[PDB]
Design a protein around this ligand. Structure first.
Ligand SMILES: Cc1c([C@@H](NC(=O)Nc2ccc3c(c2)CNC3=O)C(C)C)oc2ccc(F)cc12
Lengths: 966, 276
């Protein structure tokens, strides 16, 4: 039953079914109005729509009558009938964008803050300069956007890959399914490895006797750019494994006819729109008043006093001493006390803040006054328009991040807790009779041009420029660097050191650095990513560390370094900065970046501290992505179904056995609405694979800790047998998956260095992705068994893994299932040591099909942080020494230890890059990566205080202690 | 003389990490200091860390040709000499921007005497009495934290339903005033023929509208009953944590001060996990 509200003061009770559309509910509505009094003042069915409130408490109107009843998400079943209002399709697009990003677009109009409202109208030329670039030369330019080249940054090959090419010749299979009755004429060619994709096809037509495009059979990847064929990550990865690259020639127009022409229209808000003193003229200290705390939640008979501790910081470091207030009683928290600071007004840096808090003094135990914070909150001192805050101000206070004992939280976010049932705190800043700005960059390069021969110790500059970012720095060195600042422009990789030496609470230091960064030579983007963590908050530093990404970072590396470039947006202070104009101009020219751009932002919209600047950033992507918003909506509705179905298992069916639960699952999945959302959509783990028809016989509930969910799809491609022919995925609801997403990204960056050295160690960094709050997707690997399963079958003995792996393959190939168990049992030991991983046993070690030695389950890696030594169990030695009885002196593993030594070193010549990725992740909110005290163990396993030859001896001692260590 | 050996310098610590000096100069008055061995391990460098106004300054002690100091002219005998020279002189001699005197040395015999039960027989029993409670503040604090983070999840839902009823109830009242516009002149004043249809047409339609507009207001007023009952209990469990968190900080200073006084300095045991 639905209650309609007619346009003439009537009310009709209409019986409904839960699949009716808006037409069958509306066109039948006006035929029911005949038997009610004022039926002649009504109008025809046209020129009327509905309106109602939804789960999100929105006053939405329904221009799209093709939607059905259950698809609306109403609050109670009522309706209303009016005439339309507004633009017709704009109201349809604003409902799409609001379903993708998880919150209404109308919410961002009830925000009065003038900062939120100039981002929305000025960001729209980054969303427009992209769309005038993805569509410059069509249809070709539109083609590269949707299917972009998946290439590698380095054209030339390692030496252990050029060997497998006899005279630089590749063998490729060019399928041609061009028979009108879908018959296939496979070919075979012998061509070079430096051949462009318009010559592989230019000669496969003279074999047969133009205007075509290649494609990876099974997963529709395309070769559209004129590169060397060996540079693609498919060709380049077949020459490694010695497999055969299966291509399939296709026609252009069969591709261009799946590229629907989409357009971008400026939104509604596109068109809705004196006497200043510089900061260098004021003469006063810095004084801040503290009126009162609106209310705080502390017990009466336990806490005695409370006070408000404050401080003036510049990116983690205090610019002066910390000040307190008097200890008022619990009941009457009012201070009204001006606090004074020993900082001088023209000596405030552009990125200064105010970090305050409210602590409690238990005491009553000798001189042991044990202080404990109750809340915290930060605020900028300047404004996004360069204007010092001068007035009164309120501020709601966040909760203390539980696990943190410090009395201030300098690393948190600057803003007010949007919740309103929180302890408030009124402040008041000092009026200077007008607006006080910040000087422009032309009155700052004169204060330094006004306050203004080789040597023999150039070796100490080099000795410091090549140091660890977590290494010591002494007072003698900071003055040595700053004094020799006009020669550090020949050693450009020293700039992260020359900036921790300058003192930011004095405006002659800072005024001279700005004229020095303005001419600094560019750095490698592997090094200009240190200048974006929580230690370099100035806006001229961070605008140097972004002109280096924009001309030295490639789309290969950006795709690898994108989980950290989305965490250093939380370290920003304003909203319309230069890091967001870069990561948005990229997501709007490459749907591979935009796919993970979306899901990384969307995965953490549930967190209230970041939930307003991401939402403003999603909304700007979803409005200019184009045709790809339709696919993202179909992916979001699929996960929504899965989250719901799993909740019922976790709450209602959480007490009977698995018999009833597996039948309820097939009972729920066989349902004709669950079955229509879970089919025919791309994959969140990889946008190039496309899921298909589900398999109810394949899907099952797993007996793991949380009881996750197994799911099996089918490849809907016409050559899915050549590549794999099933997509299998795990779905987890209740376990955080950011600890592993970062563990598997290190393993994938380790293996990429080894491959370019010439060491052919082989890892398997499978896919992982967190979609929301404690919910994510775990990729499954085909034809692999855990060591526990392989050995429990063969019933204690230590030759079971060698007997099993010998049975499963034998003959001329037995010298490859032992070469591969060794090229991968070494890599996963020079990696589970460098990262202090000690949670390893049978059930989380897996050997794949031909002896590849695969590690899994990087989730409880922590929860106890002497140290973690090493493993090298005995039965993995027998497989290395070819089953010989005595493995300790075998000749085969002496080239085994020789290749663990070459590995440990190459990960030690790249220890800075690994340091600059755990430090970009400190304000992420992960409970075990908070301060630099946790990235300390990297320096104890890589031996960074020692020297190189002393480092190697540290690791040889580590192996031998576990080679026979128990 | 005043030149002693640094083995008995109470302010001397020697071989400890940078990450334990940070929580010894945390929120302490200026002129607090200690000396420890360098991390590069040249056997005799002895870096110095100074707390001058929030930051932890770190100063190098060079050791050329049996002399000590900060600058090139190393002209002192021992570190106990160089440290005592600056416990009564200002550091502005070396650094014009470092006018601080080494006032408060971080001793180590200060807390080693605070321990009680001199005999080791009471050390293992005064220890098991302080690990049963710290392992109880663990459970007692997380039993009252999920209950906190959970109830915060409920208030945000109930607080959103009220914006639902405040919209619905406003969609009905916007019709009663537009109903009255028509019902006065189009169908009842014009139909003055003593007919009873108005008792069935408007009298039976305007009644169900008024039985609905108030029917919804009885559930908004009802929803706020548990929201007020829940927002009040959300403060009662937020107050219980504050009476537990500081006491959860003291028992971590009493176990560790009993796991070091004799449990390790008296013996280098792997027997740690049975005497707790
Ligand atoms: C954590 C963590 C690391 C670090 N690893 C460890 O700290 N291992 C370790 C665990 C326990 C103990 C020890 C060491 C020593 N003593 C113990 O008890 C690296 C940087 C060394 O890398 C990560 C990547 C992704 C992610 F989510 C988390 C991490």
């Amino acid at each position: 039953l639905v209650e309609c509200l007619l346009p003439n003061g009537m009310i009709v009770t209409l019986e409904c079914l839960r699949e009716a559309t808006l037409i069958t509910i509306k066109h039948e509505l006006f035929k029911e109005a005949r038997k009610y009094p004022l039926h002649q003042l009504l109008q025809d069915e046209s020129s009327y729509i509905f309106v109602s409130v939804t789960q999100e408490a929105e006053r939405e109107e329904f221009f799209d009558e093709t939607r059905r009843l259950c698809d609306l998400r109403l609050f109670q079943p009522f309706l209303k009938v009016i005439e339309p209002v507004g633009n017709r399709e704009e109201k349809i697009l604003n409902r799409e964008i609001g379903f993708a990003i998880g919150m209404p677009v109308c919410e961002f109009d009830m925000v009065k803050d003038p900062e939120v409202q100039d981002f929305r109208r000025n960001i729209l030329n980054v969303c427009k300069e992209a769309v005038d670039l993805r569509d410059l030369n069509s249809p070709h330019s539109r083609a590269m956007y949707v299917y972009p080249p998946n290439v590698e940054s380095s054209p030339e090959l390692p030496k252990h890959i050029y060997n497998k090419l006899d005279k630089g010749q590749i063998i490729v299979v060019i399928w041609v399914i061009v028979s009108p009755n879908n018959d296939k004429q496979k070919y075979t060619l012998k061509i070079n490895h430096d051949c462009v994709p318009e010559q592989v096809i230019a000669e496969a037509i003279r074999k047969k006797t133009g205007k075509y495009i290649l494609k990876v059979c099974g997963c529709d990847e395309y070769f559209l750019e004129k590169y060397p064929l060996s540079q693609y990550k498919y060709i380049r990865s077949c020459i490694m494994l010695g497999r055969m690259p299966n291509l399939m020639l296709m026609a252009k127009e069969s591709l261009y006819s799946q590229l629907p022409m989409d357009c971008f229209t400026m939104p509604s808000y596109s068109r809705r729109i004196t006497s200043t003193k510089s900061l260098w003229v004021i003469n006063s200290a810095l004084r801040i008043k503290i009126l009162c705390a609106t209310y705080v939640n502390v017990n009466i008979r336990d806490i005695d006093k409370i006070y408000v501790r404050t401080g003036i910081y510049h990116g983690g470091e205090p610019l002066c001493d910390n000040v307190n207030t008097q200890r008022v009683p619990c009941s009457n928290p009012r201070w009204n006390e001006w606090l004074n600071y020993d900082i001088y007004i023209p000596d405030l840096p552009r990125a200064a803040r105010l970090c305050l808090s409210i602590c409690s003094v238990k005491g009553r135990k000798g001189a042991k006054e044990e202080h404990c914070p109750l809340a915290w909150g930060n605020i900028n001192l300047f404004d996004y328009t360069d204007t010092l805050v001068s007035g009164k101000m309120a501020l709601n206070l966040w909760p203390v991040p539980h696990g943190l004992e410090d009395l201030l939280n300098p690393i948190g976010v600057t803003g007010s807790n949007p919740n309103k049932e929180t302890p408030c705190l009124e402040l008041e800043f000092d009026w200077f009779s007008s607006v006080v700005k910040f000087p422009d960059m032309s009155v700052i390069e004169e204060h330094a041009n006004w306050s203004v021969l080789r040597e023999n110790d150039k070796e100490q500059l080099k000795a410091i420029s090549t140091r660890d970012p977590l290494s010591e720095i002494t007072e003698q060195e900071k003055d040595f660097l700053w004094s020799h600042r006009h020669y550090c422009v020949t050693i450009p990789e020293i700039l992260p050191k020359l900036l921790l030496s300058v003192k930011w609470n004095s405006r002659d230091e800072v005024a001279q650095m700005y004229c020095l960064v303005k001419d600094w030579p560019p750095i490698k983007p592997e090094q200009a990513m240190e200048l974006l963590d929580c230690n370099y908050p100035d806006p001229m530093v961070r605008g140097f560390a972004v002109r280096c990404l924009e001309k030295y970072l490639t789309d290969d590396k950006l795709s690898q370094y994108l989980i950290q470039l989305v965490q250093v947006l939380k370290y920003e202070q304003y909203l319309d900065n230069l890091l967001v104009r870069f990561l948005l101009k990229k997501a709007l020219t490459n749907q591979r970046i935009g796919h993970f751009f979306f899901w990384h932002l969307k995965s953490e919209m549930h967190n209230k501290t970041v939930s307003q600047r991401f939402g403003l950033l999603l909304e700007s992507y979803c409005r200019a992505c184009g045709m790809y918003l339709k696919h993202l909506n179909r992916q979001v509705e699929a996960m929504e179904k899965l989250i719901n179905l799993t909740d019922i298992l976790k709450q209602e069916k959480k007490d009977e056995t698995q018999k009833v639960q597996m039948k309820f699952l097939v009972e729920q999945m066989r349902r004709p609405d669950f079955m229509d959302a879970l089919q025919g959509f791309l994959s969140p783990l990889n946008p190039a694979h496309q899921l298909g028809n589900l398999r109810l016989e394949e899907c099952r509930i797993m007996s793991s800790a949380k009881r996750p969910l197994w799911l099996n799809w089918e490849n809907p491609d016409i050559m899915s047998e050549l590549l794999f022919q099933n997509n299998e995925i795990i779905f987890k609801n209740g376990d955080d998956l950011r600890q592993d997403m970062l563990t598997l990204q290190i393993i994938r960056i380790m293996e990429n260095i080894w491959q370019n050295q010439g060491l052919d160690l082989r890892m398997l960094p499978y896919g992982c992705l967190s979609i929301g709050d404690c919910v994510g997707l775990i990729e499954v690997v085909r034809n692999s068994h855990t060591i526990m399963q392989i050995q429990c079958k063969g019933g204690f003995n230590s030759h079971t893994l060698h007997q099993w792996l010998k049975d499963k393959n034998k003959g001329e190939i037995y010298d490859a299932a032992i070469d591969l168990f060794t090229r991968s049992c070494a890599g996963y030991c020079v990696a589970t040591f460098i990262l202090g991983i000690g949670d390893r046993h049978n059930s989380n070690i897996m050997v794949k099909d031909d002896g590849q030695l695969f590690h899994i389950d990087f989730g409880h890696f922590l929860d106890h942080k002497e140290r973690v030594p090493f493993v090298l169990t005995q039965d993995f030695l027998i497989v290395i020494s070819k089953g010989a009885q005595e493995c300790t002196k075998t000749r085969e593993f002496e080239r085994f230890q020789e290749m663990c030594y070459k590995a440990y070193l190459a990960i030690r010549q790249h220890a800075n890059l690994f340091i600059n990725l755990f430090s970009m992740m400190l304000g992420s909110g992960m409970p075990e990566l908070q301060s630099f005290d946790d990235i300390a163990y990297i320096r104890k396993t890589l031996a960074l205080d020692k020297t190189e030859q002393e480092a190697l001896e540290y690791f040889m001692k580590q192996m031998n202690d576990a080679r026979h260590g128990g | 003389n005043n030149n002693m050996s640094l083995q008995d310098a109470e302010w001397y610590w020697g071989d400890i990490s940078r990450e334990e000096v940070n929580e010894k100069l945390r929120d302490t008055a200026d002129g607090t200091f200690l000396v420890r061995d360098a991390s590069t391990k040249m056997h005799g460098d002895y870096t110095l860390t100074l707390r001058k106004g929030g930051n932890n300054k770190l100063i190098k002690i060079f050791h050329r040709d049996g002399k000590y100091g900060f600058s090139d002219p190393l002209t002192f005998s021992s570190v106990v000499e160089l440290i005592n020279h600056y416990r009564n002189e200002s550091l502005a001699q070396y650094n014009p921007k470092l006018d601080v005197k080494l006032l408060y040395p971080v001793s180590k015999y200060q807390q080693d005497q605070v321990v009680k039960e001199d005999n080791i027989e009471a050390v293992g029993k005064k220890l098991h009495e302080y690990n049963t409670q710290f392992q109880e503040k663990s459970r007692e604090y997380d039993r009252l934290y999920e209950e906190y983070t959970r109830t915060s999840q409920e208030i945000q839902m109930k607080r959103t339903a009220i914006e639902a009823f405040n919209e619905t109830i406003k969609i009905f009242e916007e019709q009663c005033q537009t109903q009255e516009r028509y019902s006065k002149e189009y169908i009842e004043k014009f139909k003055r023929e003593g007919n009873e249809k108005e008792i069935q047409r408007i009298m039976h339609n305007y009644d169900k509208l008024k039985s609905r507009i108030s029917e919804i207001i009885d559930s908004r007023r009802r929803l706020e009953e548990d929201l007020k009952k829940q927002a009040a209990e959300y403060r009662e469990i937020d107050k219980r944590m504050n009476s537990i968190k500081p006491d959860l900080i003291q028992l971590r200073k009493t176990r560790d001060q009993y796991l070091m006084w004799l449990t390790q300095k008296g013996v280098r045991q792997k027997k740690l996990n049975e005497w707790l």
